[PDB]
Write a protein that binds this ligand. Structure first.
Ligand code: CL
Ligand code: CL
Ligand code: CL
Ligand code: CL
Ligand code: CL
Ligand code: CL
Ligand code: NA
Length: 129
């Protein structure tokens, strides 16, 4: 599923991301834009052999099991394929674990390079929430 901007903001708000670990909802929408273009089906291979999955590009090195990243962990206790669902529940729940790990939203390279320090409230402007 390819979400619209406000549609995703609403889904994220309902699943408790707004101000989760102090990150306002715009930060999460901005991160999803630039990680996946709001597409739950997005996948990208990394150099190390791990793959990033879903709307928040969650990596199989640590967070999910894809059966092809040897020596990796599955800290969210989910198949990576669960992160590609039109239902963002699994992604949001695993994102909460990531953002709690110590590095905040710096875990998301697109967030650090394209969202951090910018006017992220723009991403939820005009939305009904
Ligand atoms: Cl929308
Ligand atoms: Cl947009
Ligand atoms: Cl915001
Ligand atoms: Cl699994
Ligand atoms: Cl959803
Ligand atoms: Cl933080
Ligand atoms: Na893994």
């Amino acid at each position: 599923k390819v979400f619209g901007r406000c549609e995703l903001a609403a889904a994220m708000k309902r699943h408790g991301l707004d101000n989760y670990r102090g990150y306002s909802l715009g930060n999460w929408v901005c991160a999803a834009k630039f990680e996946s273009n709001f597409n739950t089906q997005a996948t990208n291979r990394n150099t190390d052999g791990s793959t990033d999955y879903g709307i928040l590009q969650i990596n199989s090195r640590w967070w999910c099991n894809d059966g092809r990243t040897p020596g990796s962990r599955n800290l969210c206790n989910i198949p990576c394929s669960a992160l590609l669902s039109s239902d963002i529940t699994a992604s949001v729940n695993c994102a909460k674990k990531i953002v709690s790990d110590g590095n905040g939203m710096n875990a998301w390279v697109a967030w650090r390079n394209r969202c951090k320090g910018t006017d992220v409230q723009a991403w939820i402007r005009g939305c009904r929430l």
